[PDB]
Structure formats: C-alpha cells, structure tokens
C-alpha cells in the first residue's frame, strides 16, 4: 500500500522535485508538511499513505531518498521552498563527482557512499507494512548515475530479494548529446539493468522536446517541462493505488500482463491529452480520440517508431470520466486497424484500468486542464533498434581505444567492454527471435 | 462447603484482584464490605467465599503471598483492596530473582511456616472445607518455587480435600524471561506428583482470543485476567446456587480423570463476542455449544485436532430446557466421533445451574481432557534439552544448592507424562 | 481553474442534484479541499491497532 522512491544524481533529483511537487499538491500537504484532518476517530482517509507518513506532531514526510555525489543539487533542495518537507537524513550528498566515469562510481567512490544509502533504505523498509516495490530514477549517461545506480541495484537485489524494482531511466538520445563518453557508460549500465530490474521504462530528451514543440506551444522548453511530464506519467500509474475506481490495477498485475519472458522487460510509454489551452477550445476529447492519440508515434516519450516492430502487450490506464463500454469499443477499433500489429502468439493484447480521479493541474504548468486522460505502457520489439544506435557509437570509439585509459586507470579491466558489448548483442538477438512469426517443423 | 484461595506472585495477585472483584459483584458486596444485594439467593451461600465479621461486614478467605512488597502495595491501592484482612498479607524483603532454587529453598523456607500458620488458621475455621484453589505462573520465580512448596505442604496436611490449580506457562513466542525452561520443567515435575487437577493457560491463546474474537483495539493484562477470572468463577457456580442438575469439583474430578497422572485439562468459556458484532447474532444453546468446542475459544496453543478427547465437561448457567442440552451434547458427540476415545461409550458430562453470570442471560464454561496437551510439554522439554546439553546457566541453580540429578529426574518424569499421553492420542487398528 | 472540481458522471450534476449509483465508492471525509474519491480503509484495516 506504499512505494519508496530512490533518486540518483542530477536528472533523478531534478525529476524528483517535480514529482514531489505534484504529489504534494494533489494530496494537499502544505510545503511545511502540515495537513488538517477530521477531529472524530474513524472518519478519515489513507490515500497519502502510499507516499507520506505522518509524525506525532502532525508533520508529513515522504518515502524518498535523494542520492548525489556532488553537493550543489542537494544543497539547492535544502535551501529551496520544500526545506521543511524532507527529513535531513534523506538528503545524502558526497564530496566529489564520478566525473562521467562509470568505473569511478562503481569501484572507487560509490563504494564509499553505498552503505549510508542502504542504511536509509532499511530504515524506510522497517516503517512499512505492505511494501510493493521500489521506484528508481536515474540517467545512464553520467558517471555516478550509471555506476552507483548499478551498484545500488545489485545490493538491493541481494538484500531484499523478490521485492520489485521498477526503473525510469533517461537513456542517451540518438543524436542530441551532452557528453563524449556517454556510450561507454550506457553500455556498462545496461548489463546491470538487464540483470536487476523487473520493468524498465526508457526515456529520451529529444522525444520530449519534440513533443513539447509539436503539441504544446513552447518555443524554448527547459528540463522542468520534461520533468513535469514524467511526474504526470508516474502519478497516472500510481493513481490506481490511491483513489477509487471501477477496475483497479495492482503493481503485480503490470508485471503479470506486460512481461512475457523474464528478460523482455523494456517498455515504451506515452500519454494522450498533451494539449495547449488554445487547442482545448477547438478539440473534443472523447475516449476513442485519446485512445487513438496514444498510438501515434508523435505521442511517445522515447525516440523509437513502433511501426518497425510488433506489440506483445499493452496496458491502458484510464482516469477520469470513462465508461467501460467506451473503452471496449475503442480497443475493438484499435484492434481492427492494420497499421497496428501484435505478435500472433498474443491474441488478447490489452489490459485496462479505470480510476475516478482526474489529473491534477500545477500552477506553473503548460498542460491544459482536462476531464479525462489515458496513459499506456507497452512492450514492443522495436526497442531493439534503440540499442543498436548506442552500440554503433561504442564500436566507433572503441576501435581506437579512444578514452579507455581513464577506465583502466580508475580500476576496470579492459575485458568489461567486450563482455558488455556481447551482452547487448545477445539482447538484440533475443528481441529479434521472440518477435519472429510462427515456426516450422524443419 | 467452603473454598480457600491462594494467590502467589505478581501474576497471581493480579488475577486474584480481578477474581475478587467479579465475586464481590455477583454477591453484591460493597468495597466497604457491606451487603447491598437485592435477593436472598445471594445470602444463603455467601459463606462459600466470604467469612462474616461482626456488624455486617464480610472479609474474603484468601492469603496474599509475595517475595517483594511492590504488588501488595499495588493491590492495596486497587479499587477493592480495602476488603482484604490486613493480617493475611505475608511478604519478604527481597525478590526471587527469577530463580526457582532461590524461591524454593533459601527465602522460601524462611517464610513458609507463617503461610502455613495462616492457611491452617483459615482452614480450621470452616465448618466444612472444600478444596483449595491456587493461582500462579510456572515461568516465574516466587510463583513457581513457593507455590509448589506450599502445594506440597498443604497436600501433606490435607490429603482428603481437593487440590486445584490454574497455571500460566511461558509461550515459546512471547516470553519475558530467558531462564523460563528450567523453572517450567521443575514446576511441572512438582505438579504432576502433587496436583489433583491442573489447568494450563498460554498468554498467546488469551491474546488470540482478545484480538480475533473480541477485536480489542488496545488490550491490557486486565482483560487477560478477566478471561481467567470468568472461567474460575464459572466452575464454582453450581456449588453456590440452585439448579436442575447440581455438580461439584469432586464430581468433575471423578468424571474427568481416568488414571491419576492424566489430570491436566483445557478450559474455555463460550459467550465471547465484540460489542459491534453482538447485535448480529443472538445467544442460544447450539451457538454456545459450537463456540464451546471451537479451538479458537480454547485457552492453550495446542490444538484439540491433533489429539482425542478422553472426557469433557460442560457447566451451563441460565434458565433453559434440559432437552436442548442433552440433545446438543449428544449431537456434538456423534458428529465428531473420531476425536473421542472409543473405549469410553459417552465422554461428556453436563450440568445446569439457574443463575447466570452478571449481565449475561446464559453462559457455559468448558473443561476438556485432551491428549494434545502433550505438544506443549514436548516444546518446553525441547527448549530445556537445548539449554541443558550446554550447561547454559546451571551455575546459578547449583550455587543455590541444586543437584543436577534433580534436573534429570524432572526431565524423566515429564518425558513419561508425554509418553502416557502419546499412547492414548493415536489409534491402533491392529 | 486550479481549485474547481470537474463535473463528472461519478460526481453527478451539481446544479440539478442527480447522481447515478455505481460500485467502487467509499465513505467521504467532510473536510474542505479534499477529494471525495480518496480511499477509505477503516473498516478492513483498523490503523494503529495492536
């Protein structure tokens, strides 16, 4: 009935600020952690409990840790507006960064910080009674996010065992780039994400920039817009735990319906009524129209085209004014289309959810206010195409050992490059093989 | 037909305080000792638990014993504490230290003569004496050692009366003390020789009663002691009020014990239900009998379903037809026939009393002799064997003076008790 | 627009009073500014009990 969020490095903390801003404003907790309640025992709710616990003085505090190796971003959180919301132990900061080296984070520096993080997570897990997973936010392009995220997921996987770990990951975009060494860190990261995650959602900033230019009317977007979109997606997926509805969906139902084989756990995400205020005047927003919207590749938050692959499973979350009969009519119309294709071994391709709470509006936000929305997470073979562009960049750099001396000097064997590159080749072949129609006797 | 009660140690003194509250309520005795009741039926058997002092007042025939006075000051501070005779409180000056040997041999023998003097003074004052009733824990220090010492002396001095004990024994799951297995083993060794009939209670079973059946939000030891006080005051009800089919402690013993070592019994009391639920189901004899045999309502961790009933007894309080009692007890005997020992043709005694406990129109208390009690003793013996093989804490007991041979004798006697129960528990087709 | 509650089938019409009865609803806190669709679990989970 609760979930714990782990935020790592710069992207993960900045996305955390938008997430906790939204969850506070949606539940109604004030910035100092107070919330009035009812004075008579028995007339009270619980929806906050998924994300907040209350102190004996009536302050609310959230089930999150913020992990960074550089101080600046956590000190920014400490001096901002939400200073009193977080417990100070939860905001953990080291002395110096991992300098874009996965090896520095994993072997040298994250090894010092990891035990404090594990002690905080243990202290959180002891104050729970129905924990049903971990949410992790990180980028695989930078050094501390890759190295410490991998090390921490390995340790969590040993200590907690069967408990689920769901990752939201900012992967390196296919032509927008921020640092030279991104391919090495992303390749080395993906091996750990392969072994130690139950579902992984992939994001690219280039897609969210395209989405904010095309659908919203923003000439000069910045990271706060992208982070607000991510926060809305996470709020949509966790709303099924927190509010009344016709068809609830527990986090184990996602894994049961979405994952066909235990390695085939990388999923695409999209969100439907991303629309400006001017458009709201001229657009109807029926169930079938937003369902048709979620299938356009212009709606996706990862730069991949699903027409180059086959769908295995789709999970559609409706929140707001929807009637099950309209969902059924929409899904039957989608099923009729010939540009939408499912693997022939998956005839019953869809999972539905219906929740009564409509999406919340944030004071500075850019999305319009709408009475209904739908959010989809889906598993498709097209993702194999996403890995190939990173692997080509790895081969280009590695042919001349362009930067390897940093990694070897900071403690890593050269062999780890070849192992990881072979593992990504095998993952690509797995997604090719699972997606092949039918079979033959010879 | 007068009963003398003995309460020993903190647990015993607390249960006694709750018992004497319940008994004083049923007979309408004010905490000043003045009779304020509203029917003659109350007076005609008041002698059973109270002696009469001059000018109206009544005082309760009970001896209070403990090794440190903290509890006595607590009971004197309680709501009914004033009723007790000042001369009846006997206490020492230093604690038992949770040690059986300390409670039994060194500080025990110093006080025991003054306790025997008070008990004899109380016994010889009765015009006809019925059995003794003793409450104590077996896991403690002064409770176990002085309780079993006193039991042995009273059994020497009054061998023709009845000796009845209610005893609480440490959970394997919810213990307060590390050296519980030694004290428990030595006390069970003393009881199986000394006692005539012994009832055993697990605090874990009372917690499960409170949480599952009563749905109490914040239980306290007072609730646990009320459940115990309810069954203890229920067993004696036919002694002290009229009824269609009278019964007696000796009559219970004669019908329950087939052979003299098999005298350990399970207890239950049927009308238990939370204040929210009570509006949804009326009380009736089929309902009381069904709850009465439901293991959820039994006050030990061992379950009847792993053994077989040799004998059982049900005492009914209230205005009711005899036909329903007889036919219900027949139906329960017929429907669960595999759980009843086949070489006894009918295992259940019934009894009916007109006067129910206050605030219930009707109630039943259940006493059961079932072989599943062997599982409790086996568990205690297992924990003892783990501790004893390694000499884990023995120097305390040996420094007080105990021979290790005492420990081996007590282990052997409990093991033979377990074997005797085990042979009768399982079927033999041959 | 940041504070008004959207008009739904499950909230009913505010200016006529009509409200359809459907499954999946729970008792409602009467405090101001709280959503009526927040989960209620007092009947099945007595919080802070022991």
């Amino acid at each position: 009935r609760e979930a714990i969020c782990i935020h790592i490095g710069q992207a993960g903390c900045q996305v955390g600020n938008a997430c906790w801003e939204l969850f506070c404003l949606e539940h109604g907790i004030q910035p100092d952690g107070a919330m009035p309640s009812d004075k008579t025992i028995g007339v009270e709710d619980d929806a906050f409990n998924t994300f907040f616990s209350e102190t004996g003085a009536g302050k609310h505090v959230p089930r999150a840790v913020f992990l960074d190796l550089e101080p600046t971003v956590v000190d920014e959180v400490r001096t901002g507006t939400y200073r009193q919301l977080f417990h100070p132990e939860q905001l953990i900061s080291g002395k110096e960064d991992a300098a874009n080296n996965y090896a520095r984070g994993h072997y040298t520096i994250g090894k010092e910080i990891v035990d404090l993080c594990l002690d905080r997570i243990r202290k959180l897990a002891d104050n729970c009674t129905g924990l049903q997973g971990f949410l992790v936010y990180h980028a695989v392009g930078g050094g501390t996010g890759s190295g410490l995220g991998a090390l921490l997921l390995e340790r969590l996987s040993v200590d907690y065992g069967k408990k689920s770990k769901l990752g939201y990951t900012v992967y390196p975009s296919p032509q927008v780039s921020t640092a030279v060494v991104e391919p090495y860190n992303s390749v080395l990261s993906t091996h750990s994400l392969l072994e130690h995650t139950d579902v992984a959602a992939m994001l690219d900033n280039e897609a969210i920039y395209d989405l904010t230019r095309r659908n919203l009317d923003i000439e000069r977007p910045t990271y706060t817009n992208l982070n607000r979109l991510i926060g809305q997606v996470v709020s949509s997926l966790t709303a099924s735990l927190r509010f009344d509805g016709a068809l609830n969906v527990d986090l184990t139902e996602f894994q049961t319906n979405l994952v066909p084989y235990p390695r085939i756990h990388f999923v695409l995400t999209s969100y439907a009524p991303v629309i400006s205020a001017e458009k709201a005047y001229h657009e109807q927003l029926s169930v079938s129209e937003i369902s048709n919207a979620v299938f356009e590749p212009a709606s996706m938050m990862t730069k991949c085209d699903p027409r180059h692959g086959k769908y295995m499973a789709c999970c559609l979350m409706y929140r707001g004014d929807v009637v099950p009969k309209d969902v059924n009519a929409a899904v039957a119309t989608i099923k009729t289309k010939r540009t939408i294709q499912f693997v022939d071994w998956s005839p019953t391709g869809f999972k539905c959810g219906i929740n009564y709470q409509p999406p919340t509006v944030v004071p500075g936000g850019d999305l319009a206010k709408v009475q209904r929305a739908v959010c989809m997470i889906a598993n498709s073979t097209a993702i194999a195409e996403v890995f190939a562009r990173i692997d080509h960049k790895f081969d280009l750099m590695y042919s001349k050992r362009a930067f390897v001396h940093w990694y070897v000097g900071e403690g890593m064997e050269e062999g780890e490059f070849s192992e990881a590159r072979e593992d990504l080749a095998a993952l690509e072949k797995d997604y090719e093989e699972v997606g092949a129609e039918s079979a033959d006797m010879d | 037909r007068e009963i003398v009660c003995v309460q020993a140690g903190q647990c015993g003194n607390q249960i006694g305080s709750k018992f004497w509250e319940v008994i004083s309520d049923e007979h309408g005795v004010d905490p000043t000792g003045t009779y304020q009741g509203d029917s003659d039926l109350q007076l005609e058997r008041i002698n059973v638990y109270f002696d009469e002092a001059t000018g109206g007042r009544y005082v309760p025939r009970s001896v209070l014993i403990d090794l440190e006075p903290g509890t006595m000051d607590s009971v004197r501070a309680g709501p009914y504490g004033q009723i007790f005779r000042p001369d009846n409180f006997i206490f020492g000056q230093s604690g038992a230290g949770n040690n059986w040997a300390k409670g039994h041999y060194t500080e025990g023998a110093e006080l025991i003569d003054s306790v025997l003097d008070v008990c004899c003074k109380e016994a010889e004052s009765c015009d006809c004496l019925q059995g003794f009733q003793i409450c104590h824990s077996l896991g403690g220090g002064t409770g176990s050692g002085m309780g079993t010492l006193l039991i042995s002396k009273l059994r020497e001095q009054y061998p023709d009366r009845i000796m009845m004990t209610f005893s609480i024994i440490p959970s394997p799951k919810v213990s307060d003390t590390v050296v519980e297995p030694y004290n428990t083993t030595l006390s069970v060794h003393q009881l199986v020789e000394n006692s005539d009939e012994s009832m055993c209670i697990d605090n874990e079973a009372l917690y499960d009663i409170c949480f599952r059946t009563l749905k109490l939000t914040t239980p306290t030891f007072g609730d646990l002691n009320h459940l115990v006080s309810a069954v203890v005051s229920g067993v004696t009800c036919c002694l002290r009020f009229p009824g269609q089919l009278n019964s007696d402690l000796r009559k219970l013993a004669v019908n329950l014990v087939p052979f003299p070592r098999l005298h350990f019994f399970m207890m239950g009391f049927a009308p238990l239900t939370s204040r929210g639920s009570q509006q949804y189901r009326g009380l009736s004899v089929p309902e009381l009998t069904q709850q009465m045999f439901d293991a959820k309502n039994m006050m030990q961790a061992a379950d009847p379903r792993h053994g077989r009933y040799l004998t059982a007894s049900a005492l009914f309080r209230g205005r009711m037809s005899t036909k329903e009692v007889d036919e219900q007890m027949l139906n329960v005997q017929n429907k669960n026939s595999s759980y009843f020992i086949e070489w006894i043709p009918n295992n259940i005694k019934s009894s009916v009393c007109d006067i129910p406990p206050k605030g219930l129109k009707m109630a039943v208390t259940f006493i059961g002799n079932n072989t599943c009690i062997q599982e409790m003793f086996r568990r205690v013996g297992e924990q003892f064997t783990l501790m004893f093989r390694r000499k884990a804490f023995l120097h305390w007991y040996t420094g007080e003076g105990m021979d290790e041979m005492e420990f081996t004798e007590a282990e052997s006697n409990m093991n033979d008790l377990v074997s005797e129960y085990q042979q009768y528990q399982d079927a033999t087709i041959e | 627009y940041l504070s008004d509650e959207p008009i739904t089938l499950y909230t009913g019409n505010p200016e006529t009073g009509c409200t359809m009865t459907v499954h999946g609803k729970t008792p409602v806190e009467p405090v101001e500014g709280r959503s009526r669709f927040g989960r209620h679990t007092y009947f099945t989970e007595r919080k802070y009990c022991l």
């Binding site: 004996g56 | 914040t218 | 802070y48």
Partner: peptide, 26 residues
C-alpha cells in the same frame, strides 16, 4: 495520600492511551 496519587496517575494514563495514534507516536 499515596493511594489517591496512584489512582490519579493510573486514571490519567488510561485517558492518554485511549487514542491509538497517541499510544503509537504521541
């Protein structure tokens, strides 16, 4: 008197622990 003070302390404790939230984290 000692008895009056003991009774008063016990009564106030019972008044405090009646609320489960206060028993848990007051």
């Amino acid at each position: 008197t000692t008895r009056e003070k003991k009774r008063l302390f016990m009564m106030q404790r019972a008044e405090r622990l009646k609320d489960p939230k206060m028993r848990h984290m007051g």
